[PDB]
């Protein structure tokens, strides 16, 4: 395996197995779309590192591409092959990861809505929908298509046309349809916590 001299350096990170959770989340797998992680090169990615849990203290970062789990190559592993490998009983968890960067513009937004105030946005894309990304028709992600200047999002100022939506109130939008994404955004309540990154212009 080399898997060496790539765009980004690789490194074996050991996580101790003394009870408790890893404090990480993974997306991707050969049977999945992992946008915006590895758009040209698919795989398994660390999508979320809990601060400051086991994964965080060990040096794992959001965007990390997992190449091997305890010596087991997982570059072509399905999402469940990867998950099971990470859950298999072992004295110590060895992760060969490649230090791919997190998707550009990755940031969490907390948006406040006054009582009776609407969000004032519309979205495009979604799994098995119409291409929300003009630059890439294979991309089935969720993007902001419109922002009303007077709505909550408009007055907040941070949401804008083009941004990719990743999760809403801790609920992931990956693999979700347009309608499933819409019902999440509508039932969000007084406070919208949304994970976004740059998508298009």
């Amino acid at each position: 395996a080399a898997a060496l001299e790539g765009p980004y350096p690789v490194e074996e990170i050991r996580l101790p197995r003394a009870g408790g959770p890893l404090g990480l989340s993974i997306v991707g797998g050969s049977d999945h779309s992992s946008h915006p992680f590895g758009v040209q090169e698919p795989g398994v990615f660390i999508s979320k590192v809990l601060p400051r849990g086991l994964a965080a203290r060990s040096g794992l970062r959001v965007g990390d591409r997992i190449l091997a789990v305890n010596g087991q190559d997982v570059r072509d592993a399905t999402h469940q092959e990867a998950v099971s490998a990470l859950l298999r009983p072992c004295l110590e968890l060895s992760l060969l990861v490649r230090r791919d960067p997190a998707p550009p513009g990755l940031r969490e937004l907390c948006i406040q809505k006054a009582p009776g105030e609407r969000l004032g946005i519309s979205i495009r894309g979604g799994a098995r929908g119409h291409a929300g990304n003009p630059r890439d028709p294979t991309d089935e992600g969720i993007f902001i298509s419109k922002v009303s200047p007077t709505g909550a999002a408009g007055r907040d100022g941070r949401l804008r046309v083009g941004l990719r939506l990743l999760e809403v109130n801790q609920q992931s939008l990956l693999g979700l349809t347009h309608g499933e994404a819409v019902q999440l955004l509508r039932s969000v309540g007084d406070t919208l916590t949304v994970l976004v990154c740059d998508g298009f212009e």
Binding site: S25, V27, H79, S172, L174, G175
Partner: peptide
């Protein structure tokens, strides 16, 4: 949910 797994 089915596409992101927390561990």
């Amino acid at each position: 949910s089915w596409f992101q797994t927390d561990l």
